Amino acid sequence: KVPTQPIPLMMNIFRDVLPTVHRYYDQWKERAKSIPDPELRAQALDALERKEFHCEGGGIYGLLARDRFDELIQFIIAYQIMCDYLDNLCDQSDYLDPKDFRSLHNALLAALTPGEPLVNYYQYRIEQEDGGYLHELIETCQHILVTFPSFRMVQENMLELSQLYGDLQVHKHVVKEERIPRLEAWFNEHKEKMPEMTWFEFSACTGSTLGVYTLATYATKEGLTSEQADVIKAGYFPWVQGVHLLLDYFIDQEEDIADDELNFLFYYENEEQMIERFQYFVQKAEESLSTLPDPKFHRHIWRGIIAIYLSDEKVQKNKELKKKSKQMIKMGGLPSLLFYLNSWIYR
Amino acid sequence: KVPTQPIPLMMNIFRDVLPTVHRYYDQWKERAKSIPDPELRAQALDALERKEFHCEGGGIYGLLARDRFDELIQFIIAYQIMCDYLDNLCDQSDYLDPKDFRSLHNALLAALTPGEPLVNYYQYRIEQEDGGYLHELIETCQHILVTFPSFRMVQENMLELSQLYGDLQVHKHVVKEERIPRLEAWFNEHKEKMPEMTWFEFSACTGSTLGVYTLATYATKEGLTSEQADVIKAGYFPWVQGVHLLLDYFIDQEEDIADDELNFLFYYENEEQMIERFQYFVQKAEESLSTLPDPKFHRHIWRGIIAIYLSDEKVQKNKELKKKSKQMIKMGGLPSLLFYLNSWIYR
Numbered sequence: 137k138v139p140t141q142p143i144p145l146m147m148n149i150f151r152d153v154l155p156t157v158h159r160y161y162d163q164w165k166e167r168a169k170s171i172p173d174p175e176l177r178a179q180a181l182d183a184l185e186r187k188e189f190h191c192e193g194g195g196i197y198g199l200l201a202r203d204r205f206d207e208l209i210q211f212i213i214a215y216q217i218m219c220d221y222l223d224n225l226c227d228q229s230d231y232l233d234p235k236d237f238r239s240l241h242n243a244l245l246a247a248l249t250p251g252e253p254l255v256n257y258y259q260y261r262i263e264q265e266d267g268g269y270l271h272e273l274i275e276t277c278q279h280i281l282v283t284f285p286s287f288r289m290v291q292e293n294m295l296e297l298s299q300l301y302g303d304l305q306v307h308k309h310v311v312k313e314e315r316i317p318r319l320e321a322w323f324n325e326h327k328e329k330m331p332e333m334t335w336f337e338f339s340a341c342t343g344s345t346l347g348v349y350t351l352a353t354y355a356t357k358e359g360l361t362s363e364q365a366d367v368i369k370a371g372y373f374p375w376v377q378g379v380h381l382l383l384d385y386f387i388d389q390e391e392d393i394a395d396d397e398l399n400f401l402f403y404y405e406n407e408e409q410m411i412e413r414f415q416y417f418v419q420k421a422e423e424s425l426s427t428l429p430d431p432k433f434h435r436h437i438w439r440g441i442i443a444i445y446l447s448d449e450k451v452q453k454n455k456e457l458k459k460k461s462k463q464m465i466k467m468g469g470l471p472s473l474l475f476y477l478n479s480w481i482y483r
Numbered sequence: 484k485v486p487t488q489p490i491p492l493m494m495n496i497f498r499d500v501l502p503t504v505h506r507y508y509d510q511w512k513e514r515a516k517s518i519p520d521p522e523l524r525a526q527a528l529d530a531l532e533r534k535e536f537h538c539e540g541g542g543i544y545g546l547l548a549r550d551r552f553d554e555l556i557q558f559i560i561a562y563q564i565m566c567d568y569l570d571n572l573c574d575q576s577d578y579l580d581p582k583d584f585r586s587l588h589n590a591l592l593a594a595l596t597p598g599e600p601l602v603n604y605y606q607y608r609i610e611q612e613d614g615g616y617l618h619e620l621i622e623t624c625q626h627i628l629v630t631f632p633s634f635r636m637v638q639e640n641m642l643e644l645s646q647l648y649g650d651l652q653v654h655k656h657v658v659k660e661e662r663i664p665r666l667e668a669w670f671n672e673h674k675e676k677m678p679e680m681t682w683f684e685f686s687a688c689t690g691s692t693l694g695v696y697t698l699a700t701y702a703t704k705e706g707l708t709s710e711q712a713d714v715i716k717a718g719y720f721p722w723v724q725g726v727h728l729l730l731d732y733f734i735d736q737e738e739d740i741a742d743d744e745l746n747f748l749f750y751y752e753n754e755e756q757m758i759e760r761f762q763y764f765v766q767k768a769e770e771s772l773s774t775l776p777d778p779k780f781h782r783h784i785w786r787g788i789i790a791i792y793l794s795d796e797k798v799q800k801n802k803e804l805k806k807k808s809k810q811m812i813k814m815g816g817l818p819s820l821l822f823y824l825n826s827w828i829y830r
């Protein structure tokens with residue numbers, strides 16, 4: 137059974153999760169260095185250099201599936217490395233071709249489809265020589281998921297989340313003036329299936345990978361039901377994924393204002409509405425998490441997400457953002473403790 | 484309104500205590516570089532390089548005296564720097580002259596005696612040109628303690644603990660064959676005023692500086708009575724200071740065996756008696772700490788100190804020492820958590 141008390145949970149993270157994540161992550165970093173195309177190589181290494189925390193955090197789900205610990209972490213790390221690599225490729229495109237963005241994000245759907253034939257995902261861009269990097273990441277996922285006893289029960293839900301994630305990455309990276317019309321028209325197709333929210337709130341809800349890792353985790357269990365697959369998806373989507381990305385965008389505000397970059401928080405009528413809706417998402421997130429198996433573990437993952445995000449220098453070294461962050465959610469001073477602990481370690 | 488819950492306590496330590504200690508400690512490092520005598524300079528800088536954790540730990544007492552935070556920490560740092568410097572000078576003496584050891588440790592008594600004229604503390608050794616390093620550490624303590632409204636009420640108790648500490652440093656640093664005879668004669672002078680214990684248990688009890696820092700902390704209060712000053716002294720001496728040094732000796736066993744260093748645990752008739760007496764010290768220490776003002780603070784700091792000691796790789800990587808440590812004190816998974824956290828940071 138998973139640790140649900142802080143001390144054993146933290147001990148298992150430092151002893152088991154982080155060394156196991158880094159065993160595989162550090163192997164991908166060595167592979168990325170051998171990418172022949174200098175632009176693909178740079179984007180791969182930048183994602184690996186800057187976004188380690190995504191894999192370190194995602195790997196914590198390993199604790200729910202000890203019998204498949206190494207394999208589940210290898211899947212989460214391969215899938216998350218792909219997301220961060222592809223995000224860099226889309227963010228750094230000089231061409232802004234949505235066919236390219238889509239073709240790249242179809243790699244994530246291949247990763248979730250064992251025996252899906254691998255295509256040239258780079259077919260709509262000039263840079264295509266990755267020495268098999270992307271194919272190796274896809275095949276890693278394919279070969280692991282197929283060994284999970286209830287993968288077939290969760291696969292449809294994983295693909296639904298991955299498709300929504302890919303759609304977001306396509307629409308938000310096109311030429312500035314075409315982004316919001318695409319996102320609004322895209323939201324309009326899903327809004328009937330969704331709780332009452334805005335196009336930009338929906339956009340945030342689709343931008344997380346947490347639901348995919350949670351479904352992959354429970355895929356390791358014998359006799360998972362279609363009913364439970366659906367409970368597990370609904371536990372994270374839309375509310376938890378929403379809070380995750382609303383925080384990501386909260387922390388990235390000052391660089392988005394300065395770099396004229398798409399930030400979903402900027403489409404709220406005012407700050408009062410933003411804080412009120414954020415608090416609503418948090419309450420709905422707490423309610424959705426409580427429906428899950430191992431609810432106490434999920435509530436710990438979730439508190440950890442909020443705390444680590446709000447501990448960012450961008451929040452804690454900005455008097456205004458720090459004040460507004462405590463208005464959004466009170467965390468018993470954990471964000472500040474993590475900032476000052478971090479600040480002490482690296483000096 | 485002193486922080487006692489783990490998150491706010493830890494946040495204050497990382498935000499307030501450690502950065503403030505680091506600032507004053509760094510200023511002492513730069514001051515030490517100006518020591519003219521090459522050997523005194525080498526010993527001052529070595530103590531400062533190796534023993535910063537003593538000041539980091541001692542400074543946590545600042546949180547009991549928020550009004551006097553910076554001044555109390557400057558006192559604690561100056562006193563502890565002096566202790567670790569003098570320890571080095573006595574350790575690395577080629578002549579092992581107890582007159583030298585005594586004269587050096589008389590600096591600690593001067594530090595606790597404002598308006599006292601100072602001697603040449605180096606008067607019994609070859610190396611004497613420190614450019615005022617030791618005088619400035621003394622004067623730093625003297626100038627801070629006079630500003631504490633209740634210093635006069637705790638001064639006698641502080642001088643008592645400082646005298647016994649000085650006595651221990653004198654007796655333990657002489658030639659190997661004179662150490663135990665000196666330590667037994669010394670204990671025999673104090674035996675009748677102490678709870679029942681061995682000369683080597685007594686030696687352990689006198690070797691900590693916690694009592695001095697705690698007394699200095701409550702010196703910052705208006706209208707401390709003699710009764711209260713005696714309660715505060717008894718809260719740390721002898722049981723808490725005893726646990727502190729017995730635990731230090733416990734962890735360093737393998738080191739002290741192979742470097743043939745003096746270790747007071749080796750004078751127990753066997754391991755079983757050593758563990759039995761340690762458990763007794765722990766109980767008396769818990770009892771004496773519970774008599775203090777802010778008893779949850781004192782309990783939390785003491786458990787933190789124990790957890791940090793037991794997290795040492797010397798304990799956690801040594802199956803035998805790990806078994807004995809878990810007999811000696813029940814800390815649950817905290818030492819193991821701190822071990823794996825440290826292992827991760829410094830991989």
Ligand SMILES: CC(C)=CCC/C(C)=C/CC/C(C)=C/CC/C(C)=C/CO
Nearest residue numbers: 142145189190193194345436437440441
């Ligand atoms: C009891 C405690 C403190 C538990 C710690 C819980 C932690 C560290 C959770 C990390 C949160 C997490 C899963 C982050 C992953 C980030 C991710 C997948 C980002 C993709 O954009």
Ligand SMILES: CC(C)=CCC/C(C)=C/CC/C(C)=C/CC/C(C)=C/CO
Nearest residue numbers: 496536537539540541691692693788791
């Ligand atoms: C919260 C942190 C990182 C504290 C660091 C400080 C450490 C490691 C302290 C452990 C030792 C300690 C509390 C010593 C007290 C000072 C003293 C009298 C030392 C002489 O043995």
